[PDB]
Amino acid sequence: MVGLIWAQATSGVIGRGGDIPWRLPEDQAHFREITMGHTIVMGRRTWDSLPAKVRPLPGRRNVVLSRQADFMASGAEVVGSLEEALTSPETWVIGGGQVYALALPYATRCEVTEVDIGLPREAGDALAPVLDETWRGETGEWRFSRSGLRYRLYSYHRS
């Protein structure tokens, strides 16, 4: 089982300038709940964007994809191919744009948080993968964040 987990602006933007273009702390707990105790796979830039205090993410086997066969990532496993990254039965791909695209074909689950923020796609942005009709989804109710942003959760599956 390979799952993808991400948060996106309605527009599809998931990252800009090396960061996430919004604040939504309420998301942190759902992320933690889905990923805890499993192997998590991320691209090298996502690793670098993780704050030093939670790098590596505690309670998870952190796997980092990189084409630098010498890249240093303390507390994480550096692999150079996607096949090497996906050996665990329950693996959650947590980013970024490149890695989500690369892993989508292997995925049977996606936990998506939609953020109701006006943020048009700009050139160079990290973007969320587009789910076609092989996916059957379940949409949650909109909620308000203390940040002021409305957000909801989607759970997608495909056998």
Ligand X SMILES: NC(=O)C1=CN([C@@H]2O[C@H](COP(=O)(O)OP(=O)(O)OC[C@H]3O[C@@H](n4cnc5c(N)ncnc54)[C@H](OP(=O)(O)O)[C@@H]3O)[C@@H](O)[C@H]2O)C=CC1
Interface residue list for ligand X (CB under 6 A): 6-7, 14-15, 18-20, 42-46, 49, 65-68, 71, 80-82, 94-99, 102, 126
Q: Which is nearer to ligand X, 42 or 57 (CB)?
A: 42
Q: Give 141: exposed, middle or buried? Use CB within 10 Å, 0-12, 13-18, 19+.
A: exposed
> How many other C-beta atoms can be found within 10 angstroms of the C-beta atom of residue 118?
7
The two most distant CA atoms of the chain are separated, in Å, by 45
Which residue is at the shortest CB distance from ligand X?
96
Q: Which is nearer to ligand X, 33 or 159 (CB)?
A: 33
145 labeled binding residue: no
- The Cβ-side half-sphere exposure at 137, using a 13 Å CA radius, reads 15
14 labeled binding residue: yes
CB of 78 to ligand X, least distance (A): 9
15 labeled binding residue: yes
Q: Which is nearer to ligand X, 102 or 153 (CB)?
A: 102
Which secondary-structure segment (H or E) carries 16?
none
> How many other C-beta atoms can be found within 10 angstroms of the C-beta atom of residue 91?
23
Which secondary-structure segment (H or E) carries 152?
strand 150-157
CB of 45 to ligand X, least distance (A): 4
Which residues fall in the annotated binding site?
5-7, 14-19, 27, 32, 43-46, 60, 65-68, 80, 94-100, 113
